[PDB]
Amino acid sequence: GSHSMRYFFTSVSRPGRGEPRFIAVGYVDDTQFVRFDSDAASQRMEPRAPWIEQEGPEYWDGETRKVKAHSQTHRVDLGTLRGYYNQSEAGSHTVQRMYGCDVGSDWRFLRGYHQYAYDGKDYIALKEDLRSWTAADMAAQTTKHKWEAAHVAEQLRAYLEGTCVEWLRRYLENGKETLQRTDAPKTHMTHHAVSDHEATLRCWALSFYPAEITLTWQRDGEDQTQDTELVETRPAGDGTFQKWAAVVVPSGQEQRYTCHVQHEGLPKPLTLRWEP
Amino acid sequence: AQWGPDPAAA
Amino acid sequence: MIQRTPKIQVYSRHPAENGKSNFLNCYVSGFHPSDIEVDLLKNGERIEKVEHSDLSFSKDWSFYLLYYTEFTPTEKDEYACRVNHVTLSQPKIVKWDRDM
């Protein structure tokens, strides 16, 4: 299947005193592998998966240098944007950045992205061809002109199409035992009576990896989206994910209803029914 | 690994 | 400032079986800004040893965190997640229900 490497950065100003709170995290697919937190004691990029602990001191030194520099870019940015937006010195504000690369099943480059936000709104993002920028408003257009004059897109494009992919491939190999393993959902159904005439059937998917999953209900073999509820996929806390989908049915008609589960770890159709 | 050396300022 | 209120789910890491150790999770997502106060409660009292994930966010910029602690469920003990955020007038409590 397909794979991705993504980095996420959040800076939040502390206008009364000191530098922003800065939190950076990196993922391969749905696995967090590194972190930096400005409030933590180490002031180093830190490992969060066993397979990145292979990397030597050079790696940790380079990743720390880069993340610290990034934190200072956001320090300055929070000032600059305050000014672009004519905002006072009193309030806290937020800069977010995410970037990364997707690759296909052949592990070749598919697409890259680099998006930036101020106070949770779109600000500037690299277009899909990695050669120009989408600026949402006039402040961001000022940023776009700066980044065009300094040839930022060209640097980023070379990272996203090359370096990002190469490191992604290194990680998938080095962490193969987990990163290339798929964990199929563990499924079951439960039944819950509301009244004498209505029941809920809930279809459960537990302990799966990666997080991408589809749960669907049919009634007599036809798609049923009416009277359904689907919770957001959620992390279990041990690296795997969970989801359920429910349907409300007339009690006594449960056998008409089937839950269908698609996931990368399933080679074949999974269907569940309440025969119990 | 991260994009480096340092993102350009906004 | 865009303000977005947190969605909350409260649930166990593993299937819940009375008498057997486990982990209680409170997953908060969809919120902005990032300042949030999340507590796990046992029979209405704050649990002291609660850890959380490192802050991250969705493509729509909204944040998400996982708060978690060890626990051993029983028939009679009640568990809940209490959240406060600038969008909430009063704290929001979601009870842990083992069917959800």
Author numbering:
A (entry chain A): 1 to 276
B (entry chain C): 1 to 10
C (entry chain B): 0 to 99
What does the paper say about this structure?
We also solved the structure of each unligated APL to investigate whether structural changes occurred before or after binding — which, combined with an in-depth cellular and biophysical analysis of the 1E6 interaction with each APL, demonstrated the molecular mechanism mediating the high level of cross-reactivity exhibited by this preproinsulin-reactive human CD8+ T cell clone. The unligated structures of A2-AQWGPDAAA, A2-RQWGPDPAAV, A2-YQFGPDFPIA, and A2-RQFGPDFPTI were virtually identical when in complex with 1E6. For instance, the A2-ALWGPDPAAA, A2-AQWGPDAAA, and A2-RQFGPDWIVA (KD = ~208 μM, KD = 61.9 μM, and KD = 44.4 μM, respectively) were all entropically unfavorable (TΔS° = –2.9 to –5.6 kcal/mol), indicating a net change from disorder to order. These data also explain our previous findings that alteration of the anchor residue at peptide position 2 (Leu-Gln) has a direct effect on 1E6 TCR binding affinity because our structural analysis demonstrated that 1E6 made 3 additional bonds with A2-AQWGPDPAAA compared with A2-ALWGPDPAAA, consistent with the >3-fold stronger binding affinity.
We demonstrated that the TCR from the 1E6 T cell clone bound to HLA-A*0201–ALWGPDPAAA using a limited footprint and very weak binding affinity. Concomitant with our global analysis of 1E6 TCR binding to the APLs, we observed a common interaction element, consistent with our previous findings, that utilized TCR residues Tyr97α and Trp97β, forming an aromatic cap over a central GPD motif that was present in all of the APLs.
